[PDB]
């Protein structure tokens, strides 16, 4: 038993949060190209037999509410859980359309003690977002 | 037997801690581009950490930024796999 049991009736949910347009007052730019990402992910995880749900342009409040609600579903018949976040970010932070969300706040909903129907099951968070402002100059080989 | 409440999470970050992450306005982000391609090619073949390692290599090797701004030109990216998983993960049973 060195591998996760992945033959439950369902592979599980794939939640894709695609934030493209941000409230003007935040001063955050539109993330051109992100719809290409969201579409690619939808197809890719569809072919892996995940129940994909795409959500676009969520406020910070909507992100937290969505995550809370999803973590309170019954995942007993699901092998795993996947969440993809596409947004602006900083270290430890993802942006809703109107301001930031702590990544810890989101993932805490799925803690082994807080989401019992996912205890012992792989919980995957895939994050396309900045983690700061450093640039990698690279090295020729 | 208890398990840690933080066990069995995997965080697939597009970029290293402290760094920008790159997105192309036409093609999509370097990371998601690469992730989908490697999942399509290897999900029926490789364990998930090994798939993500192929993603690391693809982003690291095949992408480099182009900018009229010298500050942002010719830059590279490495994704960052963060695993608190306790077992191997195969998408096929």
């Amino acid at each position: 038993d060195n591998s996760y049991k992945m033959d439950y009736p369902e592979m599980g949910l794939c939640i894709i949060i695609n934030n493209k347009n941000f409230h003007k007052s935040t001063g955050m730019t539109s993330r051109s190209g992100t719809d290409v990402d969201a579409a690619n992910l939808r197809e890719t995880f569809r072919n892996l037999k995940y129940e994909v749900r795409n959500k676009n342009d969520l406020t910070r409040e909507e992100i937290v509410e969505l995550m809370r609600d999803v973590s309170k579903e019954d995942h007993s018949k699901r092998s795993s859980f996947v969440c993809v976040l596409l947004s602006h970010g900083e270290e430890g932070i993802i942006f809703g359309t109107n301001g930031p969300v702590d990544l810890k706040k989101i993932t805490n909903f799925f803690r082994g003690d807080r989401c019992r129907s996912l205890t012992g099951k792989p919980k995957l968070f895939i994050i396309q977002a900045c983690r700061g402002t450093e640039l990698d100059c690279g090295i020729e080989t | 037997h208890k398990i840690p409440v933080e066990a069995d999470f995997l965080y697939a970050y597009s970029t290293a801690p402290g760094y920008y992450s790159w997105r192309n306005s036409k093609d999509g982000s370097w990371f998601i581009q690469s992730l989908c391609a490697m999942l399509k090619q290897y999900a029926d073949k490789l364990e998930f950490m090994h798939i993500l390692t192929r993603v690391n290599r693809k982003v690291a090797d095949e992408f480099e930024s182009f900018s009229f701004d010298a500050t942002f030109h010719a830059k590279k990216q490495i994704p960052c796999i963060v695993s608190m998983l306790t077992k191997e993960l195969y998408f096929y049973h």
Binding site: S32, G33, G89 | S14, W22, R23, S25, S65, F66, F72
Partner: peptide, 4 residues
């Protein structure tokens, strides 16, 4: 190319 843009950054996030």
């Amino acid at each position: 190319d843009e950054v996030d």
